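Dear colleagues,

I hope this message finds you well. In preparation for our joint manuscript, I am sending the Acyltransferase (Pseudozyma tsukubaensis) sequence together with its predicted structure, so that both groups work from identical material. I would be grateful if you could confirm receipt.
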Amino acid sequence: MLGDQVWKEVSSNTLRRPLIGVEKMINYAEYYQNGNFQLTIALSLDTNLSADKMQERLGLALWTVRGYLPELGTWTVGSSQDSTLDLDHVTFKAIQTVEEAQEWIEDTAILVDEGTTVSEMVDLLSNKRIEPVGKQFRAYLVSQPRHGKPALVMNASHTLNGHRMLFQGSAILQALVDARLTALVASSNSSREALEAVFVPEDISRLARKLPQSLNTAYADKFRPDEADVEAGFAKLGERILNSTQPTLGIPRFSTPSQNPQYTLGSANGQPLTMLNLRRQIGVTEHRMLHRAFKKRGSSLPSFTYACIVNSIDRRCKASTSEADEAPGANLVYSAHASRWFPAETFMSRSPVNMAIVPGSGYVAPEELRSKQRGRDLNESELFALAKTIRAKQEQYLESPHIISYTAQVGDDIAAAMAETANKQRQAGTDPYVALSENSPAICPPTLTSQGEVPIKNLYTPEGASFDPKPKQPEYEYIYFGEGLLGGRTTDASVCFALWSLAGILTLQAHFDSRFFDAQVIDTILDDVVLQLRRSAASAVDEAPEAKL
Ligand SMILES: [Cl-]
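The corresponding structure tokens are as follows:
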């Protein structure tokens, strides 16, 4: 009941709950750091729907999805009665009229102008903060690109989202070909007339049970921690604090931000697009081979990838926080998903946890990341040993959910310090990019978040959603997606590596602002990692050729 009681009726048709934990930290970063962490995901579509059909169905599709996913209509920036800005709560307004519903549809289901490509949309959206501040989700239909395939492009705040956006997208794609929606559009003069037929005023009593809750309240409710549980979480907090001070290798940022960034995605508003997502994609067949080859070594694709990132940063940058006479270690900065401790029902329809990230920490000792024989030039055996070390340290850091016992306190501390720092920087007239970088470490530690394939249905027909191969022989209206694109947003002076899979396609990418890092160096590290993955896999498969099947 802690989950229900937390959303309180605060006005006639408005629910409100406090933000708690990582979600509160994220909300403050999005406000004070120009949309830091915000997510853009494109689902690239093959479809025999005309652009015209998709355009006339999109708004009603989004409205239909909102009916069972009211999470799409939440809001996280408001005020109190005393004027003051409020970053500490999430609110939900239950829509009571057709006009209000139509307003929300037209603000949230965007038809992109003829010509703009999916890649251009991902670049544009990942290079700015969502507006108005507080808005949590927007869907863009790119139905008439001048080249490339059409796509559903979603832009979301990270405060209440993550993995969940793929399911939100899947629901929208299902609605676009739903037989009942198609009949509605066919029988109505307009979207507004259709809406007028099927509109039901939203009921805060029923919808409260479907709105997202903090991981922290789901944790309290499911695990009911006692004092020993709290003690175990406090120990994992001490670990993260100490690891953040130990000598570490990493990628050095510019001492001062670049005023003429030389790597951009073009220019919009007259200003360069400097938030970059450098990507390496691995196809379905090669992905399977990599996955099996590293299992044959007793390793895993995510941990071996981390080892290669750590080693390639070491070799390419030769940058550390320690002295020259002292080999550094590696501070591991990574995220973990709470599904490792919570059942799948935690992430479904009843009070779902829609942002389930817990910060992870670990420290590779100097003797574990360098070889006595080869120094930084680790051979394949040594990289597998480093992978196993990294994996073991993550497994011990994450062995228990009681980490969550301190994320509310850490979230409060980071949020308060961010607001106080931002107010001080404003009063001092600090340049905005200097302000986003001066508090960042001169050396960015190796930062990799790894995501297993999320099983999202790939085929949508009037009979529903299914898992199937790309249509060779369409029998009805259908939508199929065979590839995704991620645009992460990192506005502070850090480099974030992301490893993820969608539709069997493996993507390794780095996102960062080129005002703060040499993009050529990051590009070289990504190339090094892919080369090491392929060479180590080929050697593993040479010893065990069965791993090719
Ligand atoms: Cl998540």
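For the figure legend, we might mention the following. Residues 162-163, 337, 355-357 surround chloride ion (CB under 6 Å). The CA atoms of residues 77 and 134 lie 4 Å apart.

With kind regards,
E.M.
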